[PDB]
Write a protein that binds this ligand. Structure first.
Ligand SMILES: CC(=O)N[C@H]1[C@@H]2OC[C@@H](O2)[C@@H](O[C@@H]2O[C@H](CO)[C@@H](O[C@@H]3O[C@H](CO)[C@@H](O)[C@H](O)[C@H]3NC(C)=O)[C@H](O)[C@H]2NC(C)=O)[C@@H]1O
Ligand SMILES: [Zn+2]
Ligand SMILES: [Zn+2]
Ligand SMILES: [Zn+2]
Ligand SMILES: [Zn+2]
Length: 580
């Protein structure tokens, strides 16, 4: 019965002057070194003076980790009581419980098969020594730690469970299994023959795990028939790590074995079965075996996960199309202004502007942390207001970070911003690439930060490598130094998108993957037969590039809807990746 509106409510946390903010930032590295050197007076003095900021909260967390490890419980409790509950680091939670000898968290944590922080690691050991850990899960954690070379943590965990590596029957058997599950032993052409010899003397759990390690190695190496052979010997698939079981599912997906795929996904942990990825592929598998009613319900849940690659593909199997109409008005200019007056928002903004006039990347990273801190507790209305507040200040990446956090109130123009439009459109049309794809790529590469610079030296909005820029500029009459202007950067990036596409059989999925990892790697990941675009994207071995391709293609689907481009469903945009 009511038309949509946006609450003008804004927080009014106490603000501090520009000088104080920059002084607190000035002393921030000193306070973190005081924690590491155990200078408790120097840490207390910093916290006494500092504002209620991400800086203070980060110092307080680090100090509590130090206080917990040193069993300084009087101080720990007094300072823990000063942390916003949502601001508590994971390891600080564990110390706070281990301080009471409370092991409620261990049942969840024990599911983790990789490195935890030391406080959580000790909590698990103490839970193990106390008989409070499920045996199945505890030994599974031991094996996972051995397979990812955390041999010390595995050793201590096995000791605490009462069967040490040096003495225990189960302990020493787990440890001996490294001749198969070791980082280099798993690569051996004889690992399977070795394992097949020892099968008689291993438990069902140890055998399931060990075939899991060999399957996962083969699978992430894109040797699918060998992967499927080893994974097929796993008797209890629930024994696998999360990464092992997902690469079993990726192998079966790449082989189009829909019955096996469904079966694998059914053995995943609940959190993993409910992710957009495995809801979608289980749905596709159910449809492929003839159960449309079950596939339909699974598509609906995948589609309800929000704005993302699999949610969009699911919505399309249900004949929905992307709709990018905002369902709430823009925030009023007054509210946008008042939002910037809030003490924590203003702090973020002060670090932001000061980082611009000084070229200071580390200060800019701190402005982002302050912005996330400032906005951490916001309801949907404040988040849309804050998003516009960031956008107006040119803090474009924080504009998007706030907007993409809403669930019912949707502002697609803050989720999918498009600054520099004249530039991008012109240069994309000149080399004949789709502008929605270009924005998709920029949104993922740099979140629209003109001065973005990666670790390895990828530069600008389109994150073009200096070497690539030199090769481009010599083909199209440019100076390589134009890499460092926004216009030259967009000219080179859009050209390289067109160029990689042309050299990867005109395929936008291979091109996206080639942009990020090199066209050489994009071709390596091709199969000897054609692959549906989503299968290729899901089975990319490098995690960063796998994530990257799906986000860019999903971003392009939303930009295309925002720009009014003619409707090409995401499935069709994904197309078919050809044989190598
Ligand atoms: C940490 C980081 O910044 N990672 C990636 C980030 O995202 C885009 C770029 O920056 C990306 O680099 C791509 O990196 C590959 C190298 O792995 C580049 O490809 C190379 O360059 C030319 C391609 O025409 C060839 O001569 C090389 O053979 C090729 N490598 C491979 C493996 O094929 C690629 O050009 C570059 N992309 C851009 C946009 O510069 C980086 O790794
Ligand atoms: Zn089963
Ligand atoms: Zn301002
Ligand atoms: Zn231009
Ligand atoms: Zn990048």
């Amino acid at each position: 019965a009511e038309t949509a509106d946006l609450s003008a409510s804004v927080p009014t946390r106490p603000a501090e002057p520009e000088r104080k903010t920059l002084a607190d930032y000035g002393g921030y590295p000193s306070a973190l070194d005081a924690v590491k050197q155990k200078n408790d007076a120097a840490v207390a003095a910093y916290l006494e003076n500092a504002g209620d900021s991400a800086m203070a909260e980060n110092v307080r967390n680090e100090w509590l980790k130090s206080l917990g490890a040193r069993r300084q419980w009087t101080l720990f409790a007094q300072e823990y009581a000063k942390l916003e509950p949502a601001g508590r680091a994971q390891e600080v939670e564990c110390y706070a419980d281990s301080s009471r000898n409370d092991y409620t968290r261990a049942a969840e944590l024990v599911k983790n098969t990789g490195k935890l922080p030391s406080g959580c690691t000790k909590l698990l050991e103490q839970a193990a020594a106390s008989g409070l850990l499920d045996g199945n899960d505890a030994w599974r954690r031991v094996r996972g730690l051995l397979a990812g070379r955390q041999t010390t943590d595995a050793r201590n965990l096995a000791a605490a469970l009462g069967s040490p590596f040096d003495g225990g029957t189960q302990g020493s058997r787990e440890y001996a299994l490294l001749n198969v599950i070791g980082k280099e032993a798993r690569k051996s052409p004889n690992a399977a023959a070795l394992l097949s010899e020892m099968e008689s003397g291993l438990s069902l759990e140890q055998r399931s795990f060990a075939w899991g390690v060999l399957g996962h190695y083969q699978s992430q190496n894109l040797n699918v028939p060998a992967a499927l052979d080893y994974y097929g010997k796993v008797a209890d698939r629930r024994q696998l790590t999360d990464d092992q079981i997902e690469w079993y599912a990726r192998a079966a997906l790449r082989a189009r074995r829909w019955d096996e795929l469904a079966s694998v996904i059914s053995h995943m942990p609940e959190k993993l079965q409910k992710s957009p990825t495995w809801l979608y592929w289980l749905a596709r598998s159910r449809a492929a075996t003839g159960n449309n009613q079950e596939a339909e319900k699974l598509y609906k849940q995948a589609a309800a996960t929000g704005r993302n690659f699999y949610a969009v593909l699911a919505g399309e199997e249900l004949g929905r199309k992307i709709d990018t109409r905002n369902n709430v008005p823009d925030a009023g200019k007054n509210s946008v202004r008042r939002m910037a007056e809030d003490g924590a928002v203003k702090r973020a903004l002060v670090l932001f502007q000061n980082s611009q006039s000084a070229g200071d990347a580390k200060m800019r990273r701190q402005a982002q942390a302050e912005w996330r801190f400032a906005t951490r507790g916001f309801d949907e209305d404040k988040l849309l207001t804050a998003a516009q507040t960031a956008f107006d200040h040119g803090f474009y990446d924080m504009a998007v970070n706030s907007a993409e956090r809403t669930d019912r109130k949707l502002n697609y123009t803050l989720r999918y911003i498009s600054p520099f439009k004249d530039t991008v459109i012109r240069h994309a049309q000149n080399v004949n690439v789709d502008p929605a794809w270009v924005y998709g790529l920029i949104r993922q590469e740099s979140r629209f930060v003109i001065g973005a610079q990666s670790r390895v030296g990828a530069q600008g909005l389109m994150q073009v490598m200096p070497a690539t820029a030199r090769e481009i500029a010599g083909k199209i009459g440019m100076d390589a130094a134009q890499l460092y202007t926004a216009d030259g950067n967009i000219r080179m990036g859009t050209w390289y998108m067109a160029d990689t596409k042309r050299r990867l059989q005109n395929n936008e999925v291979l091109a996206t993957a080639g942009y990020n990892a090199g066209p050489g790697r994009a071709r390596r990941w091709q199969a000897d037969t054609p692959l549906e675009g989503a299968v290729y994207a899901e089975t990319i071995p490098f995690s960063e590039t796998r994530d990257y391709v799906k986000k860019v293609m999903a971003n392009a689907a939303y930009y295309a809807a925002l720009f009014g481009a003619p409707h090409i469903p995401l499935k069709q945009r994904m197309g078919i990746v050809p044989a190598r």
